[PDB]
Write a protein that binds this ligand. Structure first.
Ligand SMILES: Oc1ccc(-c2n[nH]c(=S)n2-c2ccccc2F)c(O)c1
Length: 208
């Protein structure tokens, strides 16, 4: 298990997300689905010139998995996935300059819902999650588990769990007062409102 410090700007962004009073929390789902959609476009694009890039799985989809017992909402995609370097590098983002453009916009009059326009939408997961686990598999690397409960640090370890083939799994360990995001009708309403034009099938799993 390797422990890393977030760059100062990212720690500030996460602290801003966690501590600012902002009721429109549901936007986290749109932001994670949009990242999944970009990762899927990336593997589809590479597959246009190299069909063997899809040897790790031909299905290009997004699964939403609520688990009331574990109090987790999992977003799974079969996108390009991430290497260890991408994971350490703010999960494939330009998060340092992205955070500065975002925080400058917030001072000007913008709101937290515009986070995705600054390429740091992943961090909106902390509007609803106390802990985020990212399981990822890229064709050019091994399977890794990224994890952070914020607090200025994140961990990275080789994942010896269930192999995924290729893609990313975002496990949101929801805050006690954010369990509405495990309800079928609430997830369905959010998907329909903010993600109606995503070019991949979005499957909302049901529970026992
Ligand atoms: O919630 C996420 C977060 C990241 C990924 C991901 N996997 N591979 C690549 S590239 N991305 C990616 C997407 C958008 C911006 C930056 C990125 F690094 C994902 O599939 C889901």
């Amino acid at each position: 298990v390797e422990t890393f410090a977030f760059q100062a700007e990212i720690a500030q962004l996460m602290s801003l997300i966690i501590n600012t009073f902002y009721s429109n929390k549901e936007i986290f789902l749109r932001e994670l689905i949009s990242n999944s959609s970009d990762a899927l476009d990336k593997i589809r694009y590479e597959s246009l010139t190299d069909p063997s890039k899809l040897d790790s799985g031909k299905e290009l989809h997004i699964n939403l998995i609520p688990n009331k017992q574990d109090r987790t909402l999992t977003i799974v995609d079969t996108g390009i996935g991430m290497t260890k370097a991408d994971l350490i590098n703010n999960l494939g983002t330009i998060a340092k300059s992205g955070t500065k453009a975002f925080m400058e916009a917030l001072q000007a009059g913008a709101d937290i819902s515009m986070i995705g326009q600054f390429g740091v939408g992943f961090y909106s997961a902390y509007l609803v999650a106390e802990k985020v686990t990212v399981i990822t598999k890229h064709n050019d690397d091994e399977q890794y588990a990224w994890e952070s409960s914020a607090g200025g640090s994140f961990t990275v370890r080789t994942d010896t769990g269930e192999p995924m083939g290729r893609g990313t799994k975002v496990i949101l360990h929801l805050k006690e007062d954010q369990t509405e995001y495990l309800e079928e009708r609430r997830i369905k309403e959010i998907v329909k409102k903010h993600s109606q034009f995503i070019g991949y099938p979005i499957t909302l799993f049901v529970e026992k």
